[PDB]
Amino acid sequence: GYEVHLVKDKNLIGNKSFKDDLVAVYGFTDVNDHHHHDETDPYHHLRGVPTLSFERMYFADAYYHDDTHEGLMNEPHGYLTMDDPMDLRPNYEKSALELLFLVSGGAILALMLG
Amino acid sequence: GGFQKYPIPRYLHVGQWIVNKNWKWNTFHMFFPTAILCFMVWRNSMISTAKPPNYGEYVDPQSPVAPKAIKY
Amino acid sequence: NYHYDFCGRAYMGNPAVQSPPKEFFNYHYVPDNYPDALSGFRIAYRDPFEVQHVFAYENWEYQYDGQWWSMGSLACNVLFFCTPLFLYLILQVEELNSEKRGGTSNKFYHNNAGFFHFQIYDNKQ
Amino acid sequence: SKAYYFVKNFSWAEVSNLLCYGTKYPTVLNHQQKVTRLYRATLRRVYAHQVEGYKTDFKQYNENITDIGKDFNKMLALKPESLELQAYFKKYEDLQEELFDPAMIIDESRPYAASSGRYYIFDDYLLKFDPFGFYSPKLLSENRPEEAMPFYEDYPQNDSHWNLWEQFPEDFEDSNAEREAILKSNK
Amino acid sequence: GDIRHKFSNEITDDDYDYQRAMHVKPPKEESLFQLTNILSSVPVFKTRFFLDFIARNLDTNSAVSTSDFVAPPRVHENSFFVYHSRELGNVIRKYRSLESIVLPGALLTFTYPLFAAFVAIPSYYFMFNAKIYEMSRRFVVRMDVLPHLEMISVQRIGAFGILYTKLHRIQDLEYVPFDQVKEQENYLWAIGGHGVDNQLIFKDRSTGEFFYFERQGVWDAKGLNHPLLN
Amino acid sequence: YAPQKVVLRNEKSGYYANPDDVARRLIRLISLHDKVQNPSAITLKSTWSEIGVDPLSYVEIMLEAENEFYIELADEDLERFRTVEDAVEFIARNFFTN
Ligand SMILES: CCCCCCCCCCCCCCCCCC(=O)OC[C@H](COP(=O)([O-])OCC(O)COP(=O)([O-])OC[C@@H](COC(=O)CCCCCCCCCCCCCCCCC)OC(=O)CCCCCCCCCCCCCCCCC)OC(=O)CCCCCCCCCCCCCCCCC
Ligand SMILES: CCCCCCCCCCCCCCCCCC(=O)OC[C@H](COP(=O)([O-])OCC[N+](C)(C)C)OC(=O)CCCCCCCCCCCCCCCCC
Ligand SMILES: CCCCCCCCCCCCCCCCCC(=O)OC[C@H](COP(=O)([O-])OCC[N+](C)(C)C)OC(=O)CCCCCCCCCCCCCCCCC
Ligand SMILES: CCCCCCCCCCCCCCCCCC(=O)OC[C@H](COP(=O)([O-])OCC[N+](C)(C)C)OC(=O)CCCCCCCCCCCCCCCCC
Ligand SMILES: CCCCCCCCCCCCCCCCCC(=O)OC[C@H](COP(=O)([O-])OCC[N+](C)(C)C)OC(=O)CCCCCCCCCCCCCCCCC
Ligand SMILES: CCCCCCCCCCCCCCCCCC(=O)OC[C@H](COP(=O)(O)OCCN)OC(=O)CCCCCCCCCCCCCCCCC
Ligand SMILES: CCCCCCCCCCCCCCCC(=O)OC[C@H](COP(=O)(O)O)OC(=O)CCCCCCCCCCCCCCC
Ligand SMILES: Nc1ncnc2c1ncn2[C@@H]1O[C@H](COP(=O)(O)OP(=O)(O)O)[C@@H](O)[C@H]1O
């Protein structure tokens, strides 16, 4: 339903001339117009909201979209590292580095601290 | 006001328009433990804090606290 | 101020558009090399201009004898060439102050009679 | 227009050519292109200085644009190889230089402008990319083999070779039951 | 297009009335403390004493213009007027009249008249001379034509608001294009030349004196069409 | 919130602004010009010369169109335009922030 209603090969302004018709007073008349009365309510998100809230304080704009309805607001996502969560390899590089970190920390705690 | 929102790849761990549902509990469990850590650091550091005398106090030059020169 | 037409001796890339280079130095690998296959082993086609820039400096060379002095600026080249001499002379002038005062001098001090820093000196039965 | 006048080490002549005409080599342009581009540039600069300026005077703006329009109509009428047309071009190029303003307003809709590239738009390739199966389901058979090709596993994202020999459960039963049964049947 | 009526707690024009001080809207109602309401309510102002005071002690209707055609008194029994300045002339007169009150008053009142003069000198030379004074010197209060002499009498405002008239031969008048003087006197036209017409400047070749005509000045069709000036 | 599933760019319609409104506003701007005589004769398929826009009047109309639409049009694009159809198409498909 992304087709656009655009009129081609037909005039869009019905005025014969700018001087003879008082366009400067009455403006231009429209022909072949696709009238669409849109009564969308700005501040709908603000309707019935407490004063001390994010919507009123910061996001009190004309046509703000709520997170629950905004389809491009992201929840936390992505992979922390390049390692596959479901990997069948008995890989031990991560374990080796974790062991190095832990043993270094333990040596500091048990031999050096204090 | 701001720029128009555009899709962000799911696989990419980025902060573009990230909002967390559990942010209340996350804040609760990130604030108080940090407060306790800072309290421990503060009480540890207070042992090595120095303050000048109060309004009605004077430092006796012969008291041990008074500065002492090196004795060769 | 630097422009390609009037630089003369301070060389730089010309602003005029040019056709891509037909032949240029490229990456080459040792025979029977094991390919690098990180992150799915996806290789993109390299840009000719970028590869040419990558390998141009390594292969650049002086055309004639003595071109180095003239290239760029003679005064700056001579100053760079004499920099080690300037450093040595500054060090000696500074050491004059040390000699006349009594401070640290540029010498291999031998306070320790060959005794290394925190070395273990022991004897065996 | 790319609005890159103050970047890429343009000389003054090149910047003047860019301001007066969209190109850095006006010689390539024809007579009509030269005249129209110069007229557009002059009108743009006059609007910038005498409409969107400091205490601008609209009556003076109207008079100035009218005079410029008459002059440019005469210029267009004139032949390309005329000293009078050359004088007109020099006059209006000098006017452009005189009105040249460092830090002049650059519209945000043009390339190389302030805020031009504040955001990196991700392509459908990145959007689809999902080597692991959390967001886009991942087949146990890594890929779908195509006809006229062998069935090979996809190269993993992480190609570390720090892998142990295959691990098995403790006390794993691995006796060759098939061979034992066949041998028992043979007797 | 307005949807404020759909909500009971939405703002109203009664809530916006307080902005009428900072916002221009046609009057809706009269408050009890308005000047109009006070005057129409308090019976004191209805007294014939106050009414007669209003009628007499204020600007008179006699000086109010009554037509779009003005025939000022002739300067000479045989001359006819052509141009006359209405408002800028009076403003310049009142400004130059300050030199007869502020200046002696400043001398006799200020503790440091030399300090006042030292401050005024650079003030005059920058942002004041070109701003008002030179324009006033070259300003034409009135212009008439004497046909027997074939001359034009021009009235000008002098120091302290004094008015003096001078004669110039019609044969010595020339038109000076604004392009020839814009660069010479950019500052003058920048800050003080707005009142007078830029493209209608004339000068006397013999005496080298300019004539500035007010933009909001009245011209006489008959005077312009007289053969002497054409 | 965006779904956890993979979502791709949705090019709904190439127009980033209502093309009908863009065309009507451009036609009104053109009709405002003195050289233009009959606003009725103007259509999206009408060429500038036939509607009466001279080559020099075209640059004035295009500058005012840039001011009206809050965008900057390059000389190359303005010269490539051949009809009101092309003009409105380019303006409507233009992302006002480039
Ligand atoms: C030994 C006694 C010391 C004490 C006494 C007092 C000091 C006397 C020192 C001598 C000064 C006079 C002689 C210098 C002549 C110029 C150099 C030269 O001959 O090379 C050829 C000369 C330079 O060729 P080039 O460098 O290839 O040209 C580049 C192009 O111009 C394209 O250029 P660009 O547009 O790309 O821009 C690059 C430009 C600009 O580059 C930069 O911006 C980068 C920085 C460059 C270095 C700037 C100087 C920094 C400080 C240096 C300190 C050195 C300390 C170590 C040495 C100590 C020695 C005691 O590069 C240059 O600077 C080139 C100009 C020449 C060099 C000038 C700077 C070094 C001069 C020597 C200073 C020595 C100071 C000693 C005392 C120090 C304090 C104790 O060629 C020319 O003749 C062309 C014209 C160049 C401009 C000349 C300007 C006038 C100079 C004076 C003329 C009259 C001289 C009369 C002499 C009489 C008999 C003694
Ligand atoms: C024992 C006492 C306390 C111990 C604590 C020790 C703390 C040591 C320091 C930790 C630094 C942590 C940095 C985390 C950065 C995370 C990424 C990020 O921010 O976004 C990057 C952004 C965008 O990141 P992104 O959104 O693409 O990705 C975020 C998620 N990841 C990274 C996981 C994919 O990229 C940048 O532009 C780089 C910005 C870097 C800014 C770094 C600022 C550090 C300022 C610290 C001030 C501290 C003051 C100290 C005063 C006292 C000193 C004695
Ligand atoms: C931008 C600021 C720049 C600041 C200036 C930077 C440095 C400039 C150059 C300094 C030169 C100093 C020269 C004197 C020191 C000599 C040291 C020495 O003993 O070497 C002997 C050396 C050998 O030293 P040696 O190491 O064999 O000595 C034996 C060992 N000792 C000494 C320990 C016993 O003999 C030489 O070859 C010297 C050659 C000198 C050639 C002529 C140099 C003239 C320099 C003139 C400079 C301009 C005047 C001064 C300007 C500043 C005034 C404030
Ligand atoms: C090193 C040397 C330093 C020298 C520094 C010199 C500083 C002193 C300069 C003196 C300037 C003198 C100016 C004279 C002004 C008159 C000139 C002239 O002819 O104009 C006639 C003009 C024009 O004359 P007209 O003939 O064209 O018309 C008559 C007036 N109208 C236009 C209304 C019809 O007439 C006047 O302005 C009359 C002014 C009368 C009052 C003058 C004094 C007023 C100030 C009094 C003292 C201060 C207030 C005290 C209050 C006390 C209260 C208790
Ligand atoms: C002696 C030769 C003739 C000198 C003529 C006098 C100078 C030219 C005419 C000046 C007319 C403006 C007088 C304004 C007086 C304001 C009150 C005052 O401070 O008077 C006493 C003071 C002086 O009285 P004083 O000397 O007793 O003050 C004590 C001394 N001081 C102030 C330095 C500590 O007035 C002034 O300082 C006037 C300075 C000269 C102004 C020159 C023109 C520039 C201003 C344009 C006019 C509008 C100014 C509006 C100012 C409003 C308030 C900030
Ligand atoms: C003196 C006069 C001052 C006058 C100031 C006037 C205003 C100044 C300008 C505004 C500045 C502050 C703005 C704060 C806005 C807060 C808005 C808000 O609280 O909204 C309610 C919201 C509920 O959550 P929700 O609606 O889901 O959020 C998404 C909405 N899109 O969120 C909430 O309910 C908030 C609470 C969330 C949960 C918090 C959990 C605890 C967090 C740690 C608390 C630590 C306290 C430590 C105290 C130590 C004491 C010693
Ligand atoms: C040491 C002097 C200190 C200051 C003295 C101030 C005297 C003021 C009274 C001047 C009376 C004579 C005026 C003659 C006019 C004329 O025809 O002047 C004609 C003269 C001569 O002609 P040209 O110089 O143009 O060739 O023009 C001048 O510029 C020279 C005289 C300047 C007089 C300026 C007077 C106004 C001063 C305003 C001060 C700043 C504003 C103060 C608040 C309003
Ligand atoms: N490698 C380069 N070397 C020298 N000059 C360059 C280089 N790249 C760009 N320039 C400069 O960039 C400008 C051209 O910018 P560009 O992004 O190529 O757009 P366009 O070529 O269409 O004008 C020229 O002044 C040109 O001199």
Briefly say what this structure is.
Chain C has 125 residues and is mostly helical. Chain C has 4 helices and no strands.
Describe this structure in words.
This is part of a larger assembly, with chains A (114 residues), B (72 residues), C (125 residues), D (187 residues), E (230 residues) and F (98 residues). Chain A has 3 helices and no strands. Chain A has helices spanning 23-26, 54-57, 93-112. The longest helix of chain A is centred in the last third of the chain and has 20 residues, at 93-112. With 125 residues, chain C is mainly alpha-helical. Chain C is flat. Chain D is rod-shaped, with a radius of gyration of 36 Å. Chain D has 187 residues and is mainly alpha-helical. Helices cover 43% and strands 0% of the residues of chain D. Chains in contact: A-B, A-D, A-E, A-F, B-D, B-F, C-D, D-F. Chains D and F meet through helix 2, helix 3 and helix 5 of D and helix 3 and helix 4 of F. Chain D: ADP 2 binds at residues 2, 24. Chain D: ADP 1 binds at residues 2, 4, 24. Chain D: Keywords: Nucleotide-binding. Chain F: Its main location: mitochondrion.
Helix and strand arrangement:
This is part of a larger assembly, with chains A (114 residues), B (72 residues), C (125 residues), D (187 residues), E (230 residues) and F (98 residues).
Chain B: H1 23-45
Chain C: H1 4-7, H2 48-59, H3 67-70, H4 74-101
Chain E: H1 13-16, H2 35-41, H3 48-56, E1 80-85, H4 88-97, H5 102-109, H6 113-137, E2 142-146, E3 151-157, E4 163-169, E5 173-175, H7 179-182, H8 186-191, E6 202-204, E7 209-211, E8 217-219, H9 221-225
Antiparallel strand pairs in E: 1-2, 1-8, 2-3, 3-4, 5-6, 6-7
Bound molecules: cardiolipin, 1,2-diacyl-SN-glycero-3-phosphocholine (4 copies), 1,2-Distearoyl-sn-glycerophosphoethanolamine (3PE), the ligand CCCCCCCCCCCCCCCC(=O)OC[C@H](COP(=O)(O)O)OC(=O)CCCCCCCCCCCCCCC and adenosine-5'-diphosphate.
Keywords (chain D): Nucleotide-binding
Binding site for ADP 1 (chain D): 2, 4, 24
Binding site for ADP 2 (chain D): 2, 24
**End-to-end gap of chain C:** 80 Å
Strand content of chain F: under 5%
Number of helices of chain C: 4
Sketch the major β-sheet of chain F.
Answer: none
Q: Kindly state the number of beta strands of chain F.
A: 0
Largest interface, C-beta closer than 8 angstroms, per-chain residues: D-F, 32 and 25 residues
Quick one: overall form of chain F? elongated
The amount of helix of chain F comes to 40-55%
Assembly classification = part of a larger assembly
Intertermini distance of chain F: 27 Å
Instruction: Note the total helix count of chain F.
Output: 5
Strand content of chain C: under 5%
